Ligand binder design. Sequence first.
Ligand code: G6P
Lengths: 464, 454
Amino acid sequence: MRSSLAPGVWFFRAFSRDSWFRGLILLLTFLIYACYHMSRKPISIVKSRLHQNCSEQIKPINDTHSLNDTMWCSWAPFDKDNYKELLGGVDNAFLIAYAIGMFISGVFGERLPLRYYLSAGMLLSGLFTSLFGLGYFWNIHELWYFVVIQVCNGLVQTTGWPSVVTCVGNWFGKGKRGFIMGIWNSHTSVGNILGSLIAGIWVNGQWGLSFIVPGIITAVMGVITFLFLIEHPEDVDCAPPQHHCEEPAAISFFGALRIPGVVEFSLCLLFAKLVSYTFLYWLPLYIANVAHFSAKEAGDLSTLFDVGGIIGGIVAGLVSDYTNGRATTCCVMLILAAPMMFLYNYIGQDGIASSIVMLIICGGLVNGPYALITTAVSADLGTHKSLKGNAKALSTVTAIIDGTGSIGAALGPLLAGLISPTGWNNVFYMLISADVLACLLLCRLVYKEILAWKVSLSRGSGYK
Amino acid sequence: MRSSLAPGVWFFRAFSRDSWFRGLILLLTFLIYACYHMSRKPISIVKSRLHQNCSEQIKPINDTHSLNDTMWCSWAPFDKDNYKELLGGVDNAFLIAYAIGMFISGVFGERLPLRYYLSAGMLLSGLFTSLFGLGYFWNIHELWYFVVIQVCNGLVQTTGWPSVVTCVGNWFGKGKRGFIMGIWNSHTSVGNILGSLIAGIWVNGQWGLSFIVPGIITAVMGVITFLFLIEHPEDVDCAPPQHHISFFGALRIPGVVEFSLCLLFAKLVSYTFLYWLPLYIANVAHFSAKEAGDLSTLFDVGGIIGGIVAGLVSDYTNGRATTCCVMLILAAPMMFLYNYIGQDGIASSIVMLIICGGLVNGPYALITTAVSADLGTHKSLKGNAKALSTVTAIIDGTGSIGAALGPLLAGLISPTGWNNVFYMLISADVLACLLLCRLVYKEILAWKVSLSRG
Ligand SMILES: O=P(O)(O)OC[C@H]1O[C@H](O)[C@H](O)[C@@H](O)[C@@H]1O
């Protein structure tokens, strides 16, 4: 029988004091690194507007260039015949500046406080996109300026990820980490969707706003995370977590490599991100050549892949918990990838009905072990049981496991440009050549993990 | 030590639990009653739609018969020459059953608990109002349908105000004043200022969705109240507040009969501007249909400024009637000057209209506290709960007859001329100033002691 207390208040009463702060931090870390991606996005949207052919527009007065030169509807010095070399030389001066910047940000992230460092690593990321956006509103036509901004936009956005998993690893414990980090990784897709939808508004007109509006949203979130961030549970009298008297000093970069898993899970992720990039480079150069249906959907099937990543994580969390093996799940999910690329290649003769049901499963099998390794394996191998509690190593291990995975994407457009003139099918065999290297590199850790299972189950569970 | 607390956490960890539980209710009651006011506004903003002149109108294919219609751009029981009289048989047919409803709910308002009676009053007042717009899609042309939906909408929507002041009056004292209450009383103006913007979108087009959208938002705020509202602080156990027939036949004491005929005028002034101003701007101003409705929202920022300034001044000057008499005696020179020009660009329809809104809706929210401040001090003391509630019921029951003579009277004075309405709104404003001399004569004697000791 219903009585005097309201249903919403009776539901919200039953949660304890800790389970509201530990849900607050799981919301703020969801907002911050989702506001990073809509800053990273818009140059992959305005890349078809800095050059286009001038054969379908109005002809107001400019009858000088023999009525057609394709030189006036193209804005920048990306105007002449090499609009694919110099325009492609911006996403190398961002990725080199971002994959070098991670191994120094992981060293800086230890010593300085994580509220005066995530704030000054988000205002500068709102400034160095807005200075790029102001190149249209000013009289700017060069080459070195547009790349010297996009280098300094790459040393700044590396303050996001190690500080975020340091702020999350300080609260949660040994328990449901995989199933909660897998649900929590939805920000990498929410940021992509809201970074395409904002920058798609002002792309067919004046293109300065697509870099200024995310550059203001990021700087506003930079002061909200200034005013409401609680890094430690000790400050608000909560309970310290359960990673199974005063502040530990530090750790140096030479000492963090002696943790036994930090090299294999580093080096596998370079190949996992390379697979997940070269597949997305292979898919537009497939459906527009063979299986000619849905030529306009190539800009859509690239993101319906990415949704398959999210369910690729959560299902790869529920298996990682109740087996207590993280290397023995990430290896199997990449064994199952190679019998699904070939079956999609075989089944693409049919239409959309196969090209969704295979694409979702492929996204579940190759963005799974990226998502599980980049946030849950990279936090318990940070606070390993070999540190004896007197070493603060969580913003430095994440830098290694992420700064390998960014080098893994910096070599993406290079190897996808130095084999792609040799046919167009030959880029696909590199994916199968890389999945075998992804699988066979975790062998030592799977060899350790299986003999731990053989003690507790095949013997008969003696002295548990 | 090294990293201190955040400035938004160090600030929020200074407020007591009592302050958060008495802030939650001052937010929830605001968002309840603001959603009651926007169920009432779009019958005022759509009267500029039910009768268009078909002479000045684009005629593509809309001829069902030529030379004998002249009415195709009009709705059917509001198309004749009496379209300004039949709107007063609808808008008064609402405001009658809102008065007879509140005269009864002030007696039989205890047989159900507060939240089960408030959330069954935002759920049937969101149904009987979206039927008024759903009559468009079922396109019935009958005067009989636009009345029973309007007389039953008033009998439900009387469950708003008797069941908010006993939800606040338990938590934040048993009748309090101050600056936080001066902002809480702005809900009756915000519920009109956003009842015009939302319901003005679908006017030039299909006017069914000018009703069904607020009828959905009220019915959804009939669920958040059903799940989150707390009646008494005996349940969550916070700190209790600051503990501080024909009954004599229209009392011969110098209160009731010389005061009751003041709310009857000071509500008749403001409901004419609530139900006939977006037809004033639409008719004899710049000839819009939606912009004329949108310039009606600058009448309801005067209704905020005149609330805030009156609540600020009347506390620090030891008198509440002397901020009502002066602000009623000055609206009458200004409304006449507003009708004098009214058309010379959007310069004098912007700045004159706000200050005409600050001089008539400011003292709309104070002269009901003046009688409760003065008429607790009588030979019938505050211990007589059987009569101190009864005389306030008499005053507020005359106040609800003050609604039903505004839009009824405007709808009859309007077809005989349109300049005449701003003369009835002068003959009703100065008489509001005249019948507060009972309070002013006490106020002068109250200041005489401070002048003698000073
Ligand atoms: O019935 P409404 O027009 O919404 O008025 C609601 C309330 O507004 C103000 O607070 C008045 O001072 C009250 O007397 C009135 O009851």
